[PDB]
Design an enzyme around this catalytic site. Structure first.
Site, PDB file in Angstrom:
ATOM      1  N   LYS B  41     -12.669   3.440 -11.266  1.00 31.76           N
ATOM      2  CA  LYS B  41     -13.422   4.190 -10.247  1.00 31.76           C
ATOM      3  C   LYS B  41     -14.499   5.114 -10.802  1.00 31.76           C
ATOM      4  O   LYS B  41     -15.433   5.479 -10.080  1.00 31.76           O
ATOM      5  CB  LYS B  41     -12.499   4.992  -9.341  1.00 31.76           C
ATOM      6  N   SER B 271      -1.063  -1.203 -11.041  1.00 33.32           N
ATOM      7  CA  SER B 271      -1.901  -2.295 -10.539  1.00 33.32           C
ATOM      8  C   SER B 271      -2.377  -3.235 -11.685  1.00 33.32           C
ATOM      9  O   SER B 271      -2.651  -4.398 -11.459  1.00 33.32           O
ATOM     10  CB  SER B 271      -3.075  -1.746  -9.715  1.00 33.32           C
TER      11      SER B 271
END
Lengths: 4, 310
Positions: B41, B271
């Site tokens: 991100k 993840s």
């Protein structure tokens, strides 16, 4: 789950 | 070179070959934990700010407002600090002390919302703040802002292309906003012209991409794979470039992330375990025996110390  | 501020230092993350997954070294991982605020991100935090500057929606003295306290909130917080912007982040009061402290350390104005309202309450509070003085506040909207997949098209995708000498055959990426798989896939298929297999990964508990593409009832569900499985199709997911969807369960995501640490010495987030579990399954199909598989690992282990990972 929207806390990305 | 010397970066003018920490936002410019995004990306250039390494590829590492897996030894205990795949078949004959066909699985390679891209370590997005190596970024200015330690997740994928960081790239989108930087580029959504930069694009907002370029188009004049973000100007000196304007304040950033959002309702993320996950990786995007952290990314926006370092970018805001690095570039001299005030930022308010809304979050439910039941969020961890570790996260409150991190965000406060980065100089965020934290607005705690009602525990009972969860994320919906935090999103409404943020939207309310912006509504109160639209000319003062800007909300960057990671799920729809095209500057999200654009940074992956400009940086993440080309890094995969270059570091593999164009040999990449398959990209495997968990879908949160969809920005990573979208940008990377458009880069490799359109800019570099290579017909790779683009593999979206989602939780078996909330397999909304799978259900959508099958024309089945969309039934989101709870899961533990932080950063993916939003429970809807986000605007920044370009389904036209998705070739395959793999589902992974939370326990196997967790177990896989643990294997990455203990067997590969890779400090991967949850993840990341999910994406590798999906890649390992494809890598052991004879159809992918001679195919180079590149997997996005979005984040790093220490951000998960208080979680089921440990």
């Amino acid at each position: 789950n929207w806390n990305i | 070179a010397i970066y003018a501020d920490n936002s410019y230092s995004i990306g250039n993350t390494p590829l590492v070959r897996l030894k205990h997954f795949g078949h004959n070294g066909n699985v390679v991982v891209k370590i997005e934990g190596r970024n200015p605020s330690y997740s994928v991100k960081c790239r989108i935090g930087a580029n959504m700010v930069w694009q907002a500057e370029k188009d004049g929606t973000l100007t000196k003295g304007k304040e950033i407002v959002d309702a993320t306290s996950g990786n995007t909130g952290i990314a926006l917080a370092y970018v805001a600090a690095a570039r001299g912007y005030k930022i308010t982040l809304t979050m439910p009061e039941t969020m961890s002390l570790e996260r409150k402290r991190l965000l406060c350390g980065l100089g965020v104005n934290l607005v705690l919302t009602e525990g009972a309202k969860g994320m919906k309450g935090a999103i409404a509070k943020a939207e309310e703040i912006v509504a109160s003085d639209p000319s003062r506040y800007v909300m960057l909207k990671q799920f729809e802002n095209p500057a999200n997949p654009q940074i992956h098209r400009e940086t993440t995708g080309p890094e995969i292309w270059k570091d593999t000498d164009g040999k990449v055959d398959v990209v495997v990426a968990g879908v949160g906003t969809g920005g990573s798989i979208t940008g990377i896939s458009r880069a490799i298929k359109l800019d570099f012209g290579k017909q790779i297999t683009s593999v979206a990964v989602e939780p078996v508990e909330s397999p909304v991409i799978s259900q959508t593409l099958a024309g089945e009832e969309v039934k989101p569900g709870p899961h533990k794979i932080q950063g993916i499985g939003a429970g809807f199709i986000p605007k920044n997911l370009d389904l036209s470039i998705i070739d395959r969807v793999e589902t992974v369960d939370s326990d196997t995501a967790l177990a896989t992330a643990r294997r990455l640490m203990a067997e590969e010495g890779i400090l991967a987030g949850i993840s990341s375990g999910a994406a590798v579990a999906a890649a390992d399954r494809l890598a052991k199909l004879p159809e992918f025996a001679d195919k180079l598989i590149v997997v996005i690992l979005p984040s790093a282990s220490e951000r998960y110390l208080s979680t089921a990972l440990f």
